[PDB]
Every structure is written in C-alpha cells, then in structure tokens.
Design a protein around this nucleic acid. Structure first.
Lengths: 106, 197, 136, 171, 191
RNA sequence: UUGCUCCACACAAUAUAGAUGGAUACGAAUAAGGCGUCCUUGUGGCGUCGCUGAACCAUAGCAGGCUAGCAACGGUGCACUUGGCGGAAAGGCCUUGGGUGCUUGCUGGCGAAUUGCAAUGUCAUUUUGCGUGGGGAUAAAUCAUUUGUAUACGACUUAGA
C-alpha cells in the first residue's frame, strides 16, 4: 500500500509548568484527533517515541529514538502528560512524536 | 493535519484570529494568512482610527528611527497583533514567526489552493447583529497605506479567473453526479448503502 | 407586473414544533415544544423517545422543520397520542438529516473487515463509473 | 447555587414558666439545610426577640414543587439594600418552579441592581392564578394567543479550529 | 425589554412595483425608479398580497424597533417620490443687493451659481445631484423650485443651497439674507 | 599549469524548529444562501440541501515479489509531444497524439519463516565536495598613478594600451 503508519501523530507542546517555572521531567503531548480526557483515557500507558536524526552513525543508524509513555490526561481538551527515560530536549516544542498502539487493551 | 493551512482573513476578527494563529504556530503548524485587507475589528471606524493615532503618537524621543515602528499595511498590522501574543524575543518565538506569512490579497502561490476559515473568530458568528465594525484595509489606507486600489484590481482579476475555474468544476461534478446516479441502485451500490457508504 | 419580496422563512418556535436534543442526557432524541416559557427556554416532552417532560434552554436543542398540531400545555398522554397520530417519527427518519446521522453511526460501528469490504466495493464502483465517464 | 425550598419550623426553648411555645414557621430558599436554618434564625432574629442559643428547630423539610412541569407566572415581592438605602420591589417571572424563579430573580437583581444574596430579602413569592392580573410587559408579552417567533442568526460552535466552508446562520 | 415581535406595514399603490432581495429595495413607478441599500438595519420583509408589505423585527431592542419605523418611512418616502414626486420651493431673501441665480455648465454638470449675495465679488457654485431638476418659477418673485423623485437628493441640494449663502461676521438676526426653503410638497399634490 | 558553468550517476560528508496517504482552489450574503431544473433570463418560478471535514478522494500485493488467464478499451505512472493560458511573489495550470510500465474490475498458481515475544528498526530532503562523460563561455575589480564637480582619513567623481 501507500500508508504504513501504525501509530498516532502527536505534538510535543511544552513541559509541565507554572506561570514562571517549568518541570522538564513531565512533557505535554497533544495527540491529534482527541479533544477530551474521556477519549484521551484510551492512550494512557501507550508508548511514545521521539524520533530524530543525527549526522554521526552510532550502531548502524543515523536515527536516534527517545522513548517514553503516556501517564495521565492534562486539562479538558485531550492534552496528555508524558514521561520519558531521558527528558525531551526542549528544542522539540512543536515537534512531531509517535504514540504507538501498544501496550494494547483491545 | 495539513502541512500548510491557508486562512482567508475576510470577515475575521483580528485579535481572535491572532490568538488562534499564535497557538497554532507555537504548536508547529505552518500557517499562511491571505486577504488581510478584509479583516474586521470590533468598534467603529473613527474609534479604531483614534486608537491607531494614539499608537502612532508614540515614538522614541531622541531618535524616531529606533522607536516603535508603526506599520501601515493590514498584513503588518495583523503581524503586530500576533507578535504581541508570541514571545517573539526568544528562539522559539522567532522559529514560530518563520512559520507565518501574511499577505494582502491572494498571491499566485495560494490562489490555486484551498482557503479555510476559523469559525471562532468570524464576525458573523461572534458580533451581535447591530454592533458596528471597521475594515482593516479602509483603516490602513486612511492612516497611510498606499496600495488599496491595486489589490482591488488584482483581486477582481483573480475572482474572474476563479469563477471561470468554478464553472468547469461544477460541470464536471454534475457529470460525476449523473454518472454515479446511473451507477447507483446496483448490488454493490445497495451493499455499500447497507454498510454505510 | 407584480412586487416580489424574498420571504426568507425559518423554523418558528411554537407549540408542536419538533426539536432534536443536541446535548445532555438525551443527546440526539426528539421532543415536542409543549410551551414557551420565555424568549430563550421552552417546556418540551419527548415521551416516545424516552425524554422526560422538562424545561430546557433553546441552546440545548435543534429545531427540526417538522410541526404537528398541539394545544399549549398539553400533558404527555395527549402529546403521545397526537405524536403517534401525526406519525412524525418515520417522517423524521425519511429526512436526509436522520439518514446522515444513521450513516454516521453506522460508519462508526463498522469493523476492520467491514472497512476492507467497503474499500473493495468502492474500488469496483469507481471502476464502473470511470468506465462510464468516457462515453459522454 | 441551585436553590431548594424548605420549611423551617422552630421555637423558643421550653421553660416551666411557659412550656409549649408557638412554633413559628418560615419558608426559606437556600442551597442546603445549614443555610436554611441560618436564614431562619436570621429572619426570626429580625422579627421576634429570639436567637439560636435561646431557641431550637423542631423540623426542617424540603418542599418540592407540586407541579414541576406546569408553566406558572409568579409575582415576587422583594426587599433589597442599595448603596444609599433600602427599597421594595415587585417583579413577576414566567417560570416552571419557585426555586428556579427565585434563582433567576437573584440573577436578575445582581445583573440590574448589583444586589447580592446578602442584600436581597424575599418578602414573598405567589403564583398569579389568573392572567390579566400580570402587569409587567416583559411577561405579559408571552401570554398572547398562538404565540410563535423565529430564532434568527444561529451560531453553531465548531469543535475543530478550522472550517473548510463559510458557515451559514440560517435556521 | 426585547420585544419579541414588532412590525409595521407599508401600502403599495397600483402603478408601483417593489422588488426586495436581501436588503436591497428597488421601487419602480410612473415617475421612474429608485433603489436603496438597507444592509445596515437588520430587519425582515414579507409581501402579503402584492399591495401590502410588512416589515418586522424579532427580539429587538428599543433602537432596533425605532429603526424599523425609520425604514418604513424611508421606503414609503421612496414610493411617494416615485409616484407623486417631491417639490421643494425656495425663496431668495435680500434687503439691498439682488441675488442673481442662474445655471451654468462647468464640465456639463448643471451648476447653480449665486452672484451678488450681499454684494460680494465671490461666485458661489453649488452642484446639482442627478434626478433633481431646477426651474426658476415665474409668477412668484425670487423663487426657485427643485423637483425630483429622491427626497434625499432634493432636500440635501436645497440644504446645500441654503448653507452656501450663510452670513459671516455679522448679526444674522439683522442680516437675514439668504436662500431659504419655504415649502415642501409633491409635484402632484391633491392628486 | 587544464581553470569555470550546466546536465547524468557514483561515492562521501553535511545537517534538518521536525514528511511518514492527499494544503482537496468560486465569489458574495448571513434578518440569507448553495445546488439542480424550467421559462418570458429576472433582485424569476419550482424542487432540494445544510444542523459541520465524523466529509471527499485515495487506500489489498516482498516497504508491496515472480507468474497465468478472464472481462473492458477504461484508470494511472514515467519519458516524450502538440497547442495554449498564467507577471501580485508569474516558475505553475490545462490540453493534443502516440509509446512504454502497472492495474486490486474478476479468477488462479508460486514465494515469504530464523529480525527468533517488542526495540524508529532506518525507505524523507538540504547543502557541499570529489570523480568520471556530454554539452556550453573565454572577464572584471582593487591597489599604485591621475583628476577635483569631492574630500579630516576612508569614501566620491574622472582619466590612463
């Protein structure tokens, strides 16, 4: 076929923050399609990959991945909170990210 | 969901459109805004003209060249209203503002593209019927914009070409409607209708 | 000649006007405006669809083009009697609006095998209509 | 909040000089029983020489509407405190129940006179059983024969931030 | 208090024809035709029987129900202007200096010129809006008649002619000179 | 001392404000419109639609293989090719004709394993360099001298095979 996507696209909006203090240990993710926490509850615990590229090849690939998971919903509009092994670099505010359908409960 | 979103700024409210586009750019959606001469501001024309005159009176006293620049074009007025809502003094704000192009009229890259609207910033959906409003192109040419008539001529030419396109598109889609109307009522058509298509 | 005035009629709110409940607990059922409380809210009843008789703001419902005869302040037994007599349920179902809603929920209830099936059927119908769109 | 109507019956504490006090009763629109008893003691302190320490409450009962689905017209006499003095008012409201009628009355008073719940005293609310005793125009307007009107300029709020056609305010 | 329904009626005589799309009114009568844009007023129209038209507003405030009667008077002024016409009679008033009013043709646009207003050398030239015909009437001294269908054009031209002959730096209670509209009426009064 | 530019593929390096089916084109009004049809062509008659794009199109095959046949004479890609149109930032849109490849419109045959129970599991485009082999063209500026319509110095204005 022409489509091979087995994930949902999302955007890394920002960190968890107050008006003047952020918290890089928790990121905010806008999953496209969802607009309410009731629908966002489907995505809790799902794996998240931020996939980026580098000039130096490390172990066969110039593509590096930062892994994480969805933890909870944020707000009333379907934004979710996410955690990663290493936190996201904060230059990816607005960058795309992949929310995989596993670990599945369907 | 789209790579570039083309917003027809006609009949839109300036601040609400700006607060939509600012958040969209900061989220990373590339947005081009066309027809910025047809934007609307709530409030009567003399009132908004007085507002712009009070903004225009402000300048750096010892050197007017380094003061707040008072741009006159409607696209630059919208850009000022939007830069007020983006934290433009950072790298993130600059990178967001590079995802934005504003134009008066519709330039030839985008006149063949699909233009969308923002329903939560439209004047007919937001203003109470009876409230007075003003047009951004009229305010700009009252306060010093020089190119309001050439964009009117260019938009008339563009509208002629676009109507000549829409005639053919309407003919082809009525042909398609006749075609699938005759090709309805079959086994596959009834099966698709049962399955919801 | 004669004078012409574009009439521009739209969906007056009165007794007997059938409304579609947009949001709330009912959220998609039909009711009938029994009374008009004020400019913004009305007393409705949807007793065949299981909607309780209640006052409601008009921003929570959508007015349908359907209208049947009712006296003002009619109780729910008379509402059900006149509703079944005028037969507005299948008259609503015959409209393209209710057909669109049924199509929406059917498409939502389709499974993956059914999506594959409608894909194949759409490919077949595309082939035959594109073959047809070369002779005219 | 969303108001509930209660009857609150109370009395003075019984003494040997006078047992069996006279069991005064009030009708209170309040959000809950605590505020109901508070307003009961507040009004009884304004009317008679008694207070909560010297008295007791023998009963408190929620009064549901007899016909909560009939459209009524209520005449409501109100005392309220302005910034300069105290005034009496008579406002009449077309509504389906007494609690919702006093709710929209409180909203109306807060909107038109900036009067708060601490300022507004409900003197009484009484249903006008006969039309043509209604005397205010804004409610006499909705009592005409074969009433009907349109709803112009429909605004349908969108769930998406972008729309792909110019929306229409037809109805 | 948000009147949920107010409406006025306009009568349409026999010879006239009223065409109202969205809020653009066009009346056609024996004397000609007139048009008007009303997209600033937000009302609705309804033809009843080809000789009566109701204009209505729903859920309207005080200013809105005032403008409904205003637009009724506007459209029936158009109707009576395209049937009967409008005629404004103005007089010249002077003490010593006779005002000399003629019609010249600068660019061929039918200008009204006023000479010797209080004996000054300035020549006042007020233009004439189309649809307005001017006749300096015989049998009444010092009299000019402006006729036409549009009461707006006729009355504004008469007001321009009156305002162009204003006395400056003098007591206007003594220097009463000017061109003043004495009568407003129809071309076919007592029809 | 064989330099420069463009074109093809061949290998490297370089990064990415962030592809992972499709930015899918009337205009105007909103107390009005769109579409279809008809006539006497209008500010016309009639019917229909909206009440969201939850749409429409595309979408099956080794990350999409190798083959056989049936039905139609279509659909689509690529390289050409004819004729246009487009100057607001046109740099794109449409069209003629043939060639070539595929077609899941329909029916068949073979293959996949072992990446071992997941590990983006690598498929995009941005620039530059170096090679080949095929075209194309064979300059100026500055300093120094000089001028004085100029000038603190720079700069500016001139001249000099």
């Amino acid at each position: 076929a022409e489509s091979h996507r087995l994930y949902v696209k999302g955007k890394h909006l920002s960190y968890q923050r107050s008006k003047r203090v952020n918290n890089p240990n928790v990121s905010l993710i806008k999953i496209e399609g969802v607009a309410t926490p009731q629908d966002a509850q489907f995505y809790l615990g799902k794996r998240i990959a931020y996939v980026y590229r580098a000039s130096k090849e490390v172990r066969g690939s110039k593509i590096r991945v930062m892994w994480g998971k969805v933890t909870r919903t944020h707000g009333n509009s379907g934004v979710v909170r996410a955690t990663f092994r290493n936190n996201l670099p904060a230059k990816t505010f607005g960058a795309s990210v992949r929310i995989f359908l596993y670990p599945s409960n369907i | 969901v789209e790579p570039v979103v083309v917003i027809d700024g006609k009949g839109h409210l300036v601040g609400r459109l700006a607060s939509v586009v600012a958040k969209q750019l900061l989220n990373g959606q590339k947005i081009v805004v066309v027809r910025a001469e047809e934007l609307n501001i709530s409030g009567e024309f003399f009132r908004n003209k007085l507002k712009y005159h009070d903004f225009l009176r402000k300048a750096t006293a010892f050197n007017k060249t380094r003061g707040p620049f008072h741009f006159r074009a409607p696209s630059r007025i919208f850009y000022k209203a939007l830069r007020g809502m983006v934290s433009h003094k950072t790298a993130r704000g600059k990178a967001a503002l590079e995802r934005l192009k504003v134009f008066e009229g519709i330039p030839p890259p985008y006149d063949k593209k699909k233009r969308v609207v923002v329903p939560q910033a439209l004047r007919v959906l937001r203003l109470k019927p009876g409230r007075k409003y003003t047009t951004l192109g009229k305010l700009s040419t009252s306060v010093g914009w020089k190119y309001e008539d050439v964009v009117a001529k260019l938009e008339a030419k563009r509208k002629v070409s676009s109507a000549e396109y829409y005639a053919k598109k309407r003919a082809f889609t009525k042909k398609v409607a006749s075609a699938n109307a005759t090709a309805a009522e079959s086994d596959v058509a009834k099966q698709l209708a049962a399955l919801g298509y | 000649t004669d004078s012409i005035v574009k009439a521009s009629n739209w969906r007056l709110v009165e007794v007997g006007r059938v409304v579609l409940i947009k949001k709330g607990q009912s959220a998609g059922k039909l009711a009938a405006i029994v009374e008009i409380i004020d400019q913004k809210k009305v007393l409705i009843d949807g007793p065949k669809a299981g909607v309780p008789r209640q006052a409601i703001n008009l921003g929570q419902v959508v007015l349908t083009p359907l209208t049947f005869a009712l006296p003002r302040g009619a109780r729910t037994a008379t509402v059900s009697k006149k509703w079944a007599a005028a037969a507005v349920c299948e008259k609503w179902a015959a409209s393209s609006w209710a057909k669109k809603i049924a199509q929406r929920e059917r498409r939502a209830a389709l499974t993956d095998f059914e999506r594959f099936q409608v894909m194949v059927l759409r490919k077949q119908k595309r082939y035959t209509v594109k073959k047809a769109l070369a002779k005219a | 909040a969303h108001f509930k109507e209660y009857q609150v019956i109370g009395r003075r504490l019984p003494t040997e000089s006078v047992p069996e006090p006279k069991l005064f009763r009030m009708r209170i629109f309040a959000s809950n029983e605590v505020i109901a008893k508070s307003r009961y003691w507040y009004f009884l302190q304004k009317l008679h020489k008694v207070k909560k320490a010297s008295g007791e409450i023998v009963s408190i009962n929620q009064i549901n509407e007899a016909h909560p689905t009939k459209v009524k017209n209520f005449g409501v006499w109100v005392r309220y405190d302005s910034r300069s003095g105290t005034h009496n008012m008579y406002k009449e409201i077309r509504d389906v129940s007494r609690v919702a009628a006093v709710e929209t009355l409180y909203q109306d008073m807060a909107a038109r006179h900036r009067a708060r719940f601490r300022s507004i005293h409900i003197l009484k609310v009484a249903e006008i059983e006969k039309t043509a005793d209604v005397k205010r125009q804004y409610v006499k307007q909705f009592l005409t024969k074969d009433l009907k009107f349109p709803l112009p300029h429909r605004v349908q709020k969108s769930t998406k931030t972008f729309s792909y056609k110019r929306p229409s305010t037809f109805y | 208090m948000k009147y949920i329904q107010t409406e006025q009626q306009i009568e349409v005589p026999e010879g006239v024809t009223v065409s109202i799309k969205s809020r653009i009114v066009k009346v056609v009568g024996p004397r000609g035709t007139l048009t008007k844009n009303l997209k600033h007023i937000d009302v609705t129209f309804t033809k009843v029987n080809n000789q009566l038209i109701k204009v209505a507003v729903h859920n309207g405030g005080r200013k809105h129900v005032a403008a409904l009667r205003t637009v009724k008077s506007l459209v029936d002024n158009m109707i009576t202007g395209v049937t009967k016409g409008y005629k404004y009679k103005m007089r010249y008033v002077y003490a010593h200096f006779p005002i000399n009013v003629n019609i010249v043709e600068k660019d061929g646009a039918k200008f009204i010129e006023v000479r010797n207003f209080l004996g000054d050398k300035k020549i006042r030239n007020v233009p004439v809006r189309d649809g307005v015909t001017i006749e300096f009437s015989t049998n009444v001294k010092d009299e000019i008649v402006l006729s036409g269908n549009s009461v707006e054009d006729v009355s504004q031209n008469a007001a321009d002619l009156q305002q162009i002959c204003r006395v400056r730096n003098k007591d206007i209670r003594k220097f009463l000179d000017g061109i003043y509209v004495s009568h407003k009426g129809f071309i076919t009064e007592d029809l």
